[PDB]
Amino acid sequence: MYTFVVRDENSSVYAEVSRLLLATGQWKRLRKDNPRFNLMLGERNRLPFGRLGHEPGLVQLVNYYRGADKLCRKASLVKLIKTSPELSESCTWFPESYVIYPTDEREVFLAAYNRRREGREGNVWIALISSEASELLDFIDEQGQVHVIQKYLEKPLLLEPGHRKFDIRSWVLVDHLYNIYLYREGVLRTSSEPYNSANFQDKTCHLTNHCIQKNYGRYEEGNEMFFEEFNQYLMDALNTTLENSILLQIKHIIRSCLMCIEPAISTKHLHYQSFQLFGFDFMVDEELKVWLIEVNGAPACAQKLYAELCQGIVDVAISSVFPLASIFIKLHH
Amino acid sequence: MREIVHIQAGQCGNQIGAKFWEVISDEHGIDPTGSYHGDSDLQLERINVYYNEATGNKYVPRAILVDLEPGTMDSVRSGPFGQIFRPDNFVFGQSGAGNNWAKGHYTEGAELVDSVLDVVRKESESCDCLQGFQLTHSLGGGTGSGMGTLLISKIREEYPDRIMNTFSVMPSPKVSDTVVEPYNATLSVHQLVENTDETYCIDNEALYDICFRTLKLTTPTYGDLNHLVSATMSGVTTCLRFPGQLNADLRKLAVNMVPFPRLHFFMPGFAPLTSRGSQQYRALTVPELTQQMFDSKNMMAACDPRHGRYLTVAAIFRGRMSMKEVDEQMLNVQNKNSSYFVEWIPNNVKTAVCDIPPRGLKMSATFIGNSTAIQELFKRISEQFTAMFRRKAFLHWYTGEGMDEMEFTEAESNMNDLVSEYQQYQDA
Amino acid sequence: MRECISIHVGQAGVQIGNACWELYCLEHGIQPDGQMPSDKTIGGGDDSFNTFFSETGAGKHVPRAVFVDLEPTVIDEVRTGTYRQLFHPEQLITGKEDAANNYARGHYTIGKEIIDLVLDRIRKLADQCTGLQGFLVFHSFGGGTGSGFTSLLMERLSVDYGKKSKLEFSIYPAPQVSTAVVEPYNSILTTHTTLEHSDCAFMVDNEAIYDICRRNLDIERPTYTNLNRLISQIVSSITASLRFDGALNVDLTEFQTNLVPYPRIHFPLATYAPVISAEKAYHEQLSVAEITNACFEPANQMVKCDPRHGKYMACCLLYRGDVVPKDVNAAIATIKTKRSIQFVDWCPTGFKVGINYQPPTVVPGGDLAKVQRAVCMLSNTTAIAEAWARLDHKFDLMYAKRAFVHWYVGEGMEEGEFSEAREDMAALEKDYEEVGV
Amino acid sequence: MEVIELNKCTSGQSFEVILKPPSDPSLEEIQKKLEAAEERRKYQEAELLKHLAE
């Protein structure tokens, strides 16, 4: 009998994981504060990593990597890419980005902005989307919070029919041994309204996430296209596969990101162990070049895929440490 | 803190007391005449806790024998280790207490108590650094109960900075002398709650049931009951008596076992359970000891541990065994039952080891639990008290000695308070 | 030359003291009777080892040490032990009734009655000093005497020797070898009362030492003896610079200067390598690079915590054995590129290094194999605050229900001293967080 | 990279390596608190002995 505790209420992913652990009957749930657990499903906010791995005769495992926030905050990520030799300013798969503070790299941003306006090539940026530098910096100050200014991707790949925008979400599980597992099922979060080169204030055609899409649901159930249909499209429309044109690049990016922070976050020789589920968000441009947009440290899943993934989380992350009585592509670390 | 002073009062008190000294003298290499004839240094290093050294060179128990009747004490004197006791430490009257707490506490006992305190004083004066006192008595009779609790109150007055520890035998209808036992026990519990630091609840109900259900003795005697008591008593005092990795005394026991001063009534347990005569040859494994020591059927207080929570536990393992395997098994049983241990006292289960096993065993485990389930014992006595008291039945035996019914009402209320004070910590 | 007085308080303080003085005698070639054949100035001297040992006309080398316990049986082991002749009876001080694992009893009740005598026996040692620089104080956090009495002593030392430095070697409580359920109470009370009076404190978590003994020495169930032989090696590494010729950490003031920029944040993390079993038949000897790399493994630390997720304020490497600067610098260079090492912005990213060519001495028949080189790293990292976090949580759990509090109140302590001590700890945890994130 | 303070002796050496640059209560008050606690102990004990007198 193994013991576990639940400290995140709002987590759909781990609500289903606990439900699955209980269903084996070989896992008993304890109350939030009982420290005699084998497994912690932690809070997102100020999780007490300092209190783990100090219980004699209990192997302890947590579902977050301490330090993985470096990858999972927009300002942190830019800094990480720019300052790490492994990734660099030369980095070809992350959009040109700048950290902007209001009471910092404001001067470096303006100089690159003007050099874009030498013969005036595409000079549209995101923070929320604008075409000139002045309305961007004025918006950031109106908030009193740190944000990122990023070269907006003016030439996206557009699904037909419908001239539609999209982002790809990939689910990645890093286990206690730092194996990087990419869940074979991804998802495209589609726009339902035709993409508009001229009008950057209209936001249902430029921004793709599941919530801000409330013309919704027109082409696929809930603005979600899956890999089978997207691959079919790519074969029929572009004479390629999802594997060749997109996934090679996705696998490369994921692997580069996670190998870069590995010395800083690995639990290989530590008194407690960690695993974590990440959501990487990708943009595809019209030449089928992939760009990383966001890494999410506490992602939700797509409704259809909950059962399979959550079961996978139990198989490779939990039972591997705590055995009982593949849906993942392992990215070779 | 070196010397313990031992007091045994009344029939039960003196019978379990004599057996305790038989057992621990055997464990320490001491024979009936007071002579050391053992072959381990561990036997002598802390012998001053319980024994005085006469120039002899003899070892004399720091033990005072008290009764209001001569019978039981004459029996001690002509019993196996009878000659070992300092004859000046036999303090006895002639009239008896008639199973009456009022006689022991107010009338007959009052007459004898000063001469007991004289003997207590002489022993206390001869102490390098007195830890405090241990009393054996029952709560159901008159002398151990009424006079025993009178002694405790007078000992506390004269030595308010010493520890008071009791082994208190609780009455049961299953092994009963008189109908007035619940009266005598309730009056006594009221006293124990205020004036002891720690009390082992030795429940005659539990002792009976163990002898009957587990030891397969169809008709248990007091002798069979006392076999269990002396094994438990040897076990719980191991860490006071022998040098080890944890060196304990009565105060350190109290500090670490009692989180709230009134909640000081311990449920002791023992494994393996055996009888006198027919004894097992099959050796016990560390997982078997650990499982048995925590089983309800091995507890000396008839309460269900699952109907409450452990505030604190001390566990003592005796014999040559793997201390690594002990630690693992103790941790295993906590980690697999952690809802029964309060989560607001970290590390509330403590284990200690001693190499010397008790007589006739290769290994043994002794259990000391402060559980909120002990409330079941007190509730049982309360129900029996109220069944009689609501009709004032048998009260004339007490009013005849000058007591008033108010005193019964007060002792009942205090024992009910104790019960709901346990219930309070069982929820949080 | 400037003298140091060692003070050993309670069971842990005394047994660790015993191990340290045994080792010190082996390193300096001082025999159990106190004779030192290699010391050619009979009955006097101002050599580096005289910082820790005085000398008698007969040529006896006597520790500048006092041992105090509120109970006799542990100090009685010293009185009749193999090193019995080394100490003057006046240096071994015992009461009769211990503190019963209760801070309030060690500090107020039993403490009040022996404090003046201890201070008188310390004064006797100090009168023999030409330029006393101060004190090394060994004790547990968890014990009633180690916590209660120590904090009393420290306050009084600040009064009677206001110019002097005070250093601690402190045993942080671990359930695996703990003796009391109230150790978290005693730890928070002693840390609050001692904080202003201590210049530098080296915490040793019994959990870390216990596991090092299990993992690297293959000891199945470590005893205090196992633990203390290891602890004494680490203490010796730390104090070596006071006892031998050199130019780093030569006096107590330099400990604070090099390790403690911010006075409240005075707990450096010690990391030691290598720890190798004496029973290990075939052992490949570890290089400067390997031993130095091992200084950044949590598994080799005195307190288990994660320095990758904090910031450094200072870092000394202390080598013993066959080590030259060039190999140290080459090792550091490659470690810098592989490990997460982050200093606070207002401090130089760097390392003070000390090398003593003598390899570590080992206790004959002990558990530790002789090695050709060893290192102790002392880093002031904000990561050590994880240990305070752990302890404060355990305190909060019991204190929320006031469990055991009556035992302290009954010794004359007020309830308010608990919340006062605990608020100070809350401020300490905040300090570490302000400096470190 | 930069090696400063190189000091050598027969017994060993010390130096510094810089990788990167930057960017009490009185004796009276003590005796007071010790006596205050002793007075709380005396009082709680007097309260006990009075209860026992009753």
Ligand SMILES: Nc1nc2c(ncn2[C@@H]2O[C@H](COP(=O)(O)OP(=O)(O)OP(=O)(O)O)[C@@H](O)[C@H]2O)c(=O)[nH]1
């Ligand atoms: N490392 C080590 N720890 C010890 C030793 N002795 C005791 N301890 C630890 O110190 C704590 C208990 O404190 P002790 O020093 O034994 O108590 P004390 O200071 O003598 O105070 P009293 O309560 O008066 O006995 C526990 O956490 C023990 O694990 C020792 O020799 N070595």
Ligand SMILES: Nc1nc2c(ncn2[C@@H]2O[C@H](COP(=O)(O)OP(=O)(O)O)[C@@H](O)[C@H]2O)c(=O)[nH]1
């Ligand atoms: N376990 C045990 N219980 C006893 C023994 N003798 C008497 N009792 C119990 O003690 C109670 C009666 O008290 P007893 O000690 O005989 O009376 P006293 O001499 O007036 O104190 C009843 O509850 C009896 O069951 C004994 O030797 N062992």
Ligand SMILES: COc1ccc(N(C)c2cc(=O)oc3ccccc23)cc1O
């Ligand atoms: C809940 O934590 C503890 C409980 C008790 C003890 N001490 C002091 C004991 C003293 C003793 O007389 O018998 C023992 C037998 C076994 C284990 C401990 C004790 C210490 C603790 O931390």
Ligand SMILES: [Ca+2]
């Ligand atoms: Ca000399």
Ligand SMILES: [Mg+2]
């Ligand atoms: Mg009878």
Ligand SMILES: [Mg+2]
């Ligand atoms: Mg002690």
